[PDB]
Amino acid sequence: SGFRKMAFPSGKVEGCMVQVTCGTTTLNGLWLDDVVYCPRHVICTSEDMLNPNYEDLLIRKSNHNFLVQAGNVQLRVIGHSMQNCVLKLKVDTANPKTPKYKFVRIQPGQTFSVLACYNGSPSGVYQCAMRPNFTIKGSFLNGSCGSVGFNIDYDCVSFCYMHHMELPTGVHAGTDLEGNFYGPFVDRQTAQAAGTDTTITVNVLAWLYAAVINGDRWFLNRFTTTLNDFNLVAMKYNYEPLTQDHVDILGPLSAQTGIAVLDMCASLKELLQNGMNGRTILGSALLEDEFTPFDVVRQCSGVTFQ
Amino acid sequence: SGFRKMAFPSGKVEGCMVQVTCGTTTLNGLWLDDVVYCPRHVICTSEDMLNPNYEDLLIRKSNHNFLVQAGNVQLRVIGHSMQNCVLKLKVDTANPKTPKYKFVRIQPGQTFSVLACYNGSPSGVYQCAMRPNFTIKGSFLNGSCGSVGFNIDYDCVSFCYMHHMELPTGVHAGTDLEGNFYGPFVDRQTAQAAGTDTTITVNVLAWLYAAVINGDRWFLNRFTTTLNDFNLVAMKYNYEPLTQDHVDILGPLSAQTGIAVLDMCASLKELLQNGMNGRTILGSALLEDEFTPFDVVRQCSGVTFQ
Ligand SMILES: *CC(=O)N1N=C(c2ccccc2)[C@H](c2ccccc2)[C@@H]1c1ccccc1
Ligand SMILES: *CC(=O)N1N=C(c2ccccc2)[C@H](c2ccccc2)[C@@H]1c1ccccc1
């Protein structure tokens, strides 16, 4: 019993973290096989970041201008290329600690673990959700760029996020491992609108099922609702509209608890309209939306990894 | 910027996790040098747990009755001994992945990371506090026994907790690595009173300083207080009494923010008496007490580990 925001074990990702320096800028890189992936803004100074022409800046850089260090050993850079907002530095040695991996572009609402790094060294690990507005609410200081987000499936690491920047609002933005930003963000020091953030309705419902499983049931009511009726309430509270795909995904939790998805929706509707009245659910005084249905089942089943 | 409940990178601890089986009972063990540490209740059946005589049960077990498996390799057990509530199984091979380590007995209020394991395999990592009543609020299913709690200081892992049981109330109990329980708990299936839990006042204050550092300042008031005056309010709300040692420990955060500790105490007093009025602090609708002053500074400075 008990429900916690759990991150994946970070061991396989720690073995891939390297320090990348170009000029006076140092950040983190990800060493997989004979390639080191890192944000392309490693080639910029603080002044370049106001309006960088990455193509022109990269032309003035040669392989020897990139210093890659894994622990205390220096890797020899024999190739460099820019793919969207990421730099791929080809090194002469394959990482002997390269785990089985995939590069994946996650959907908004999905979750992943972040291994926050500074100077190529890990400092901590935490679980994040890709918000519907394609930002993340992480913990990232200067030098954390290049830290990655990932999921583990038994022995396979699916990398999905690379940290690039903090918006003036305090939230974080980054790319997938092909260097494509999540959201409309660009890698430059300019004010950028993230847009209205909405609550991940399917995740709040999954967390309500995790609550019932762990004995927190005060919020269960004698009401039911319809998809269109619940969505009228969801639109008023800036919650993502619920679809039959989301209902289908909640099927296993509904079968386990004996509570129909539309009955859980009615309970959520009452919590939205009336608040929590000074009560808590799984130790929280607000509705949590950072657990997918897959996170709830994984945690309640104790699925393990290599 | 941003503030998260961050766990230490778990890589050094993953390399130490093994599966220990005795009869039909399987749980996790910690392999450091040529010794495997695990809960002594690995020698029990479900029926033995009602009133176990560990000494009599252990006498019927020989080295060959303990199956220790690290990944797919079987370790040869050449010695066994019981130290308080832990079994120490001497194996013929030292763990080649043994990190630099220490065994430490933490104080109530201090924090640590838990690497939840099943069958010797890691499933996840999260940060916990040792509550003032010596319980932890973790996430532990059947088979999670033997999972450990730890802290990292650069290259050194200080193990402080080994999971032993879940109380009928849903909270968790365990030992230090010498097998001494934290709290008055015993390793038997009997109802056990954890006692009144109190809020870690020094940690709530440290988290209020983390809030100010990250721009959340609505709660700052025009009042001050005294230690005895604040403690009258602390006793009413089941908060740990604040001492000059706690004030001394908050010194660096007070010097960084320019906010005197007694002024932060007055703000906390107003939050306790008036509530949060539907507002949030660092994304939470309640007062968080699972961050020590050392966790706030470490996170705000980005201290890294090996
Ligand atoms: C994420 C990160 O560490 N850093 N990101 C920036 C940045 C991103 C977008 C717009 C402006 C700045 C910082 C930076 C500073 C100078 C050159 C490139 C990036 C910041 C950082 C700080 C120190 C070293 C590397 C990166
Ligand atoms: C922590 C854990 O996995 N387990 N703890 C107990 C336990 C502890 C205290 C009192 C009763 C039971 C479970 C257990 C069951 C049978 C024998 C010993 C311990 C439980 C567990 C489940 C499966 C394998 C090992 C341990």
Pocket test for ligand 2, best of B24, B40, B42, B49 (most atoms within 8 A of CB): B49
Q: Which ligand is nearest to the CA of B190?
A: 2
Resolution (A): 1.9
Rounded to the nearest angstrom, the minimum Cα separation between A163 and chain B is 13
**Encoded tokens for B287:** 């007062």
Residue A140: name the closest of B300, B52, B207, B304 by CA.
Answer: B300
Interchain pair B123, A284: CB under 8 A: no
- Return all residues near A31 (Cβ < 8 A) that are at least 6 apart: A16, A17, A18, A68, A70, A75, A91, A95, A98
**Cα(A140)–Cα(A153) distance, rounded to whole angstroms?**
26
**Encoded tokens for A256:** 């386990």
Interchain pair B9, A124: CB under 8 A: yes
B44 in contact with ligand 2, CB cutoff 6 A: yes
A26 in contact with ligand 1, CB cutoff 6 A: yes
Beta-ladder partners of A115: A125, A148
- For residues B134 and B101, the answer to whether their CB atoms sit within 8 Å is no
B163 in contact with ligand 2, CB cutoff 6 A: yes
Residue of A nearest to B12 (CA): A11
Task: Indicate the length of chain B as a whole number.
Answer: 306
Q: The dihedral of CA A133, A139, A140, A144: what is its sign?
A: negative
* Residues of B that are catalytic: 41, 145
Q: Whose CA is nearest to atom 23 of ligand 1?
A: A143
A12 in contact with ligand 1, CB cutoff 6 A: no
Residue B131: name the closest of B264, B211, B235, B239 by CA.
Answer: B239
**Cα(A139)–Cα(A128) distance, rounded to whole angstroms?**
10
Pocket test for ligand 1, best of A22, A26, A27 (most atoms within 8 A of CB): A27
The CA-based diameter of chain B, rounded to the nearest angstrom, is: 69
Interchain pair B284, A280: CB under 8 A: no
Interchain pair A304, B119: CB under 8 A: yes
- For residues A188 and A44, the answer to whether their CB atoms sit within 8 Å is no
**Cα(A225)–Cα(B267) distance, rounded to whole angstroms?**
43
Residue of B nearest to A144 (CA): B302
**Cα(B270)–Cα(B186) distance, rounded to whole angstroms?**
40
**Cα(A141)–Cα(A162) distance, rounded to whole angstroms?**
14
**Cα(B64)–Cα(B92) distance, rounded to whole angstroms?**
13
CA distances from B9 to B32, B162, B213, B304 (A): 18, 18, 24, 10
Angle between helices B261-274 and B201-213 (to 10 degrees): 100
DSSP A159: E
Domain A11-91, second-level architecture: Beta Barrel (2.40)
Interchain pair B3, A299: CB under 8 A: no
Q: Whose CA is nearest to atom 5 of ligand 2?
A: B165
B41 in contact with ligand 2, CB cutoff 6 A: yes
Interruptions in chain B after residues (C–N over 2.5 Å): none
In this chain, the answer to whether the domains covering A11-91 and A201-301 adopt an identical fold is no
- Nearest CB to B14 within list A9, A121, A139: A9
What's the per-residue H, E or C state across B147-211?
Answer: CEEEEEECCEEEEEEEEEEECCCCCEEEECCCCCECCCCCCCCCCCCCCCCCECHHHHHHHHHHH
Q: Is the domain covering A201-301 a CATH 1.10.1840.10 domain?
A: yes
Q: How far is the CA of B292 from the centre of ligand 2 (A)?
A: 31
- Nearest CB to B170 within list A1, A140, A301: A1
**Encoded tokens for A215:** 């004995």
Coil, helix or strand at residue B87: strand
Q: Whose CA is nearest to atom 5 of ligand 1?
A: A165
Interchain pair B2, A286: CB under 8 A: no
Task: Indicate the length of chain A as a whole number.
Answer: 306
Name every chain A residue with its beta carbon within 8 A of the beta carbon of B172.
2
Residue B117: name the closest of A54, A240, A11, A269 by CA.
Answer: A11
Instruction: For residue B191, report the phi and psi dihedrals to the nearest 5 degrees.
Output: -65, 130
> B265-275 burial string, b = 16+ CB within 10 Å, else e?
bbbbbbbbeee
CB-side exposure of A176: number of CA atoms within 13 Å?
14
Helix and strand counts by DSSP (H, E) for chain B: 8, 13
Name every chain B residue with its beta carbon within 8 A of the beta carbon of A299.
124, 139
Experimental method of this PDB entry: X-ray
Name every chain A residue with its beta carbon within 8 A of the beta carbon of B4.
124, 126, 137-139
The CB density around residue B158, as the number of other CB atoms within 10 Å, is 16
Coil, helix or strand at residue A199: strand
Instruction: For residue A100, report the phi and psi dihedrals to the nearest 5 degrees.
Output: -70, 125
- Nearest CB to B123 within list A1, A117, A303: A303
Coil, helix or strand at residue B231: helix
Coil, helix or strand at residue B263: helix
Residue B110: name the closest of B160, B42, B170, B157 by CA.
Answer: B160
The identity of residue A212, as a single letter, is V
Rounded to the nearest angstrom, the minimum Cα separation between B154 and chain A is 9
Strands (E), chain A: 17-22, 25-32, 35-39, 66-70, 73-75, 77-83, 86-91, 100-103, 111-118, 121-129, 148-153, 156-166, 172-175
Coil, helix or strand at residue B31: strand
Q: Whose CA is nearest to atom 8 of ligand 1?
A: A165
> A254-272 burial string, b = 16+ CB within 10 Å, else e?
beebebebbbbbbbbbbbb
The CB density around residue B81, as the number of other CB atoms within 10 Å, is 11
The CA-based diameter of chain A, rounded to the nearest angstrom, is: 69
**Cα(A181)–Cα(A136) distance, rounded to whole angstroms?**
12
- For residues B39 and B85, the answer to whether their CB atoms sit within 8 Å is yes
